[PDB]
DNA sequence: TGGCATAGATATCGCACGTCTATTATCCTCAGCGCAATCAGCTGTGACTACCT
């Protein structure tokens, strides 16, 4: 489980008083819930996947 | 006596049900712009009076 790590986002870590290191290539690429940005995954369901 | 069909005990993973929290928009109300019938000051009209011949 040590080699299991909870990953955040960018600014889930600024919240967390901590800077994700600049051009640094993100570790997880997963879903995210946001505004209209978000629903519109379920307007294009192709979408849904490709939004990381 | 020896190998394997078959009955018993034990979980086990896939599928569905109950529950929660997200990390950046919308809806009443006021001061400032308008449209529609009177009323006073500008303008036009009639009369009084100084001035010239």
């Given at each position: 489980?040590?080699?299991?790590?909870?990953?955040?986002?960018?600014?889930?870590?600024?919240?967390?008083?901590?800077?994700?290191?600049?051009?640094?290539?993100?570790?997880k690429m997963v879903k995210?819930?946001?505004?209209?940005?978000?629903?519109?995954?379920?307007?294009?369901?192709?979408?849904?996947?490709?939004?990381?």
């Open positions: 489980r040590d080699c299991v790590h909870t990953l955040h986002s960018r600014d889930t870590w600024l919240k967390k008083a901590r800077v994700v290191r600049l051009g640094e290539v993100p570790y995210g819930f946001s505004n209209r940005a978000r629903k519109a995954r379920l307007a294009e369901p192709q979408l849904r996947e490709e939004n990381d």
